[PDB]
């Protein structure tokens, strides 16, 4: 047997210059690393965009040698105990270490917004008590969920979804490092599948390389578990409602694709239908989103998809 | 013993196919790039057999010490399985080298908090432990858990393979099945072999004659507790051809006597109506939109009689377009 090292873990960024997206936030973090004084910061944004990686890279940049022991990572929603993690924070902060005067120990907490008001007040008191030695970083989805004192004391950094250009640049870097043979349509397919999700894009690239070796559209969509975009495009653009329903019933519903995947792929494909007028695309997107809302409420049947197709067809032919 | 345990596809030969997943996992192991795997699809496709075969091939004789098999949904709760995983990953033998595999079955049954805890555990022990997650529906899993794992989808078995397996089960169990009953069973199971085996065993149990009697489609529909196509066809004919009083009476009488929920009646009627040859497309547009609205309203509660009359009116009004 041998050790396992996935590409996603292997090529996670280490220095702040490795991160591709969020140019302004990365520039601010680089400035903070340069001037050698980390303030308390709260990073917020939509979930799954890799917020904690930025503060880990910041800690690596700040601590030239103390990066191994000067970083503590915890999860606020971890049911091991809010009091338990608070006590661990107190122990880590009270544990002084040899450092240059401008640096401090760094604690990273995830899912801070899910904490109670009392828990946030306790963390605020702890941060004030050990502000001379340990600085805190809070990762949250909604900034307003964090109490006002913490927001006022901390510096808010906003993290946004990565654009397709950043995903393309990162994928090209990984491909060059991994001598991956690819085609432009394959990378376009991977970027299309992973809507700003760097982790999913890297995972799909690795899986496609393992499965087929060549990264082209057909291989990518064979590896990818979502419905094929060409099938969804044929279903959406069919001039006859019977044809659209037939394509759905045969190629998507009977193939085992879930309704969530179908509506998500419909949203993705409709958004990119360049030959259709944008007003028509917006109407189609509105209908697809309505059925997505219905599905997420627990209906998620075949009749909802058929009705979505009926409304889209009604829009298309005017 | 349950008929699901028997006739289980314990070997790759009994697997219907789609060995591309097996080959890709094998190449992941060979290249040292094996990620946390997620196998999902219809129940009974053989995900458990595939993963145990892969584990046997990877490790060899030292199977039980390096591989831990668990069911994510168990009566002992989240804490017990979490403790099991933590004590399995934390402990290291003298010959500790490589990685250790943990397999979770029926992971979609876990609650969101349990899934988040499992994701945190996977992230913590990822240095020396590789997780394989099995589920029936990938969409039921939390997006946070889906991001960690590499998704592999299992296609439903082709109808010919299902028919061959059904014939094998019938000849092994000495059961005679009507062709209509077989078609009904295949349609109801929609590719789930576990459902096929359970329904066949229950139907054999319910027969007054254990071996000589023939299982009809009526018996299959009673065993599954599903709307019979004859009832739905009668309701649809009454709606289309009879006046409002007769249609209302027929719908209420049929779906109360036979115990058919209104949403199941709508689903069956939509399934039947798809085979109709409609001259006008507006008929289909109105039918689909109105019936979807009615079903969505039913999901939220509301007045049942009003919703039934809404179904009748929606079907009647659309066919005015011919």
């Amino acid at each position: 047997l041998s050790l396992q090292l996935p590409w996603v873990e292997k090529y996670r960024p280490q220095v702040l210059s490795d991160i591709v997206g969020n140019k302004e936030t990365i520039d601010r973090l680089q400035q903070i690393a340069k001037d050698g004084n980390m303030p308390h910061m709260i990073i917020s944004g939509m979930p799954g965009i890799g917020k904690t990686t930025s503060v880990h890279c910041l800690a690596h940049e700040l601590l030239g040698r103390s990066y191994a022991d000067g970083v503590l990572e915890l999860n606020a929603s971890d049911d091991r105990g809010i009091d338990v993690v608070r006590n661990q924070i107190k122990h880590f902060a009270q544990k002084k270490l040899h450092l240059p005067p401008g640096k401090h120990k760094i604690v990273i907490l995830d899912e801070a917004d899910s904490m109670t008001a009392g828990a946030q007040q306790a963390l605020r008191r702890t941060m004030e008590l050990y502000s001379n030695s340990t600085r805190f970083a809070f990762a949250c989805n909604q900034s307003n969920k964090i109490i006002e004192p913490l927001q006022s004391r901390c510096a808010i950094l906003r993290y946004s979804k990565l654009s397709d250009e950043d995903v393309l640049k990162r994928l090209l870097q990984i491909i060059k490092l991994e001598d991956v043979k690819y085609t432009n349509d394959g990378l376009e397919a991977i970027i299309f599948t992973a809507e700003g999700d760097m982790r999913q894009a890297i995972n799909n690239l690795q899986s496609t390389v393992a499965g087929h070796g060549l990264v082209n559209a057909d291989n990518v969509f064979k590896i990818v578990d979502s419905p094929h975009p060409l099938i969804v495009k044929k279903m959406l653009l069919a001039s006859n409602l019977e044809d659209s329903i037939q394509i759905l019933r045969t190629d998507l519903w009977k193939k085992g694709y879930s309704s969530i995947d179908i509506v998500t792929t419909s949203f993705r494909v409709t958004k990119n239908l360049a030959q259709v007028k944008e007003s028509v695309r917006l109407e189609m997107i509105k209908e697809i989103g309505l059925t997505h809302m219905r599905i997420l409420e627990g209906v998620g049947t075949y009749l909802q998809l058929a009705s979505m197709l009926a409304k889209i067809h009604k829009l298309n032919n005017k | 013993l349950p008929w699901v345990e028997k006739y289980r596809p314990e070997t790759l030969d009994e697997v219907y196919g789609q060995n591309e997943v097996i080959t890709t996992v094998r190449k992941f192991v060979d290249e040292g790039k094996l990620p946390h795997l997620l196998f999902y699809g219809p129940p009974g496709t053989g995900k458990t057999s595939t993963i145990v075969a892969l584990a046997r091939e990877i490790y060899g004789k030292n199977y039980s010490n390096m591989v831990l098999e668990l069911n994510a949904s168990d009566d002992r709760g989240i804490d017990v399985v979490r403790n099991q995983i933590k004590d399995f990953a934390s402990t290291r033998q003298i010959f500790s080298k490589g990685f250790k595999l943990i397999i979770l079955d029926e992971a979609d049954a876990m609650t969101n908090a349990a899934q988040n805890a499992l994701r945190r555990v996977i992230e913590r022990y990822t240095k020396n432990t590789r997780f394989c997650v099995l589920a029936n529906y990938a969409h039921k899993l939390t997006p946070a858990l889906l991001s960690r794992c590499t998704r592999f989808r299992f296609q439903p078995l082709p109808q010919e393979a299902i028919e061959r397996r059904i014939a094998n089960v019938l000849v092994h169990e000495k059961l005679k099945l009507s062709p209509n009953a077989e078609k009904a069973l295949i349609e109801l199971s929609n590719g789930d072999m576990r459902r096929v085996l359970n329904v066949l065993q229950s139907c054999k149990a319910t027969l007054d004659n254990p071996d000589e009697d023939e299982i009809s489609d009526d018996v299959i529909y009673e065993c599954c507790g599903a709307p019979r196509p004859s009832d739905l066809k009668a309701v649809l004919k009454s709606i289309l051809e009879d006046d409002w009083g007769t249609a209302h009476y027929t719908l209420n009488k049929v779906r109360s006597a036979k115990g058919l929920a209104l949403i199941d009646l709508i689903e069956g009627i939509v399934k039947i109506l798809e085979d109709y040859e409609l001259q006008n497309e507006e008929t289909r547009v109105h039918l689909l939109t109105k019936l979807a609205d009615i079903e969505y309203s039913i999901s939220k509660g509301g007045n049942d009689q009003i919703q039934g009359s809404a179904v009748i009116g929606a079907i009647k009004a659309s066919f005015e377009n011919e």
């Binding site: - | 359970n198 007045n303 009689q305 919703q307």
Partner: protein
Amino acid sequence: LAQQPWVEKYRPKNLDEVTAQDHAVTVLKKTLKSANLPHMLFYGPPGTGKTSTILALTKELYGPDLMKSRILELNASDERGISIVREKVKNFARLTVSKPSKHDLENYPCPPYKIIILDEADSMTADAQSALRRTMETYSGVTRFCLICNYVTRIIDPLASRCSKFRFKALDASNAIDRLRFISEQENVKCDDGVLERILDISAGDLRRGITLLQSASKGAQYLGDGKNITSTQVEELAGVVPHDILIEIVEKVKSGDFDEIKKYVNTFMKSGWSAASVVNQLHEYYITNDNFDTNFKNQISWLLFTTDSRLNNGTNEHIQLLNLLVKISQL
């Protein structure tokens, strides 16, 4: 003794006392003759005798005294979620089986297992039913499940396969009215002409709701110490049902079609406190089953009533919804 609800007071005691469910009672008698009792799935219209029959079967299996210890009655819709129900079932199964006395052993078969009755099973979600199936599989050695529901099609296939299904026919109007009349005579309830018929109509044939309404009417007539017969207006009041005169006035105002008259009437109507949902339900009943309206009118009015009911179910202002509904019908 203290006062007891008439629903549980007049349940049939033995299987021979179930009136109209000949088929289900016969099949259950045959199953009881066998020493092995499978999982049972009771389905049919509400208030037909499902819980009564399962209780009678349990009483015959265990005896009047041992029945309480061997039975756990649950309601899957009443509980917070799956976890509480499954934990209660686990605790009941882990609890040691009660010791039957010599009389219990010699007068009744006293099977070793314990029967668990789960009411309103069809209201469970798919995940809840799958967890229930897993729990049933875990403790199938000592517990036999009975699922009581109105729609068998709302129960998932894996769970429904394990259960032998008994279909209960809807009670005929004559049988239900005779049962209500017997209850009224036993309890000395003075009822005028058509009061029991009105109770059945309000309950939509549900004998449980009919008995509950009859008991409430009897208590109300006890409060009003005039000693007179219960009137249909009183039972309409106790059920939150709008009087037919107000419904006819609403229909006439809609027929005339003047917007201002309809608005004024709805403003006056909302001050009386009558429920708007009851008005929508009774308007649906009036219009749909009426021979003086053609097919197109009813096609339109069914959708109108459906839209109004859907909006009312969202917790909206009753006045606005009712006015919109009445104005839209007047334009048909």
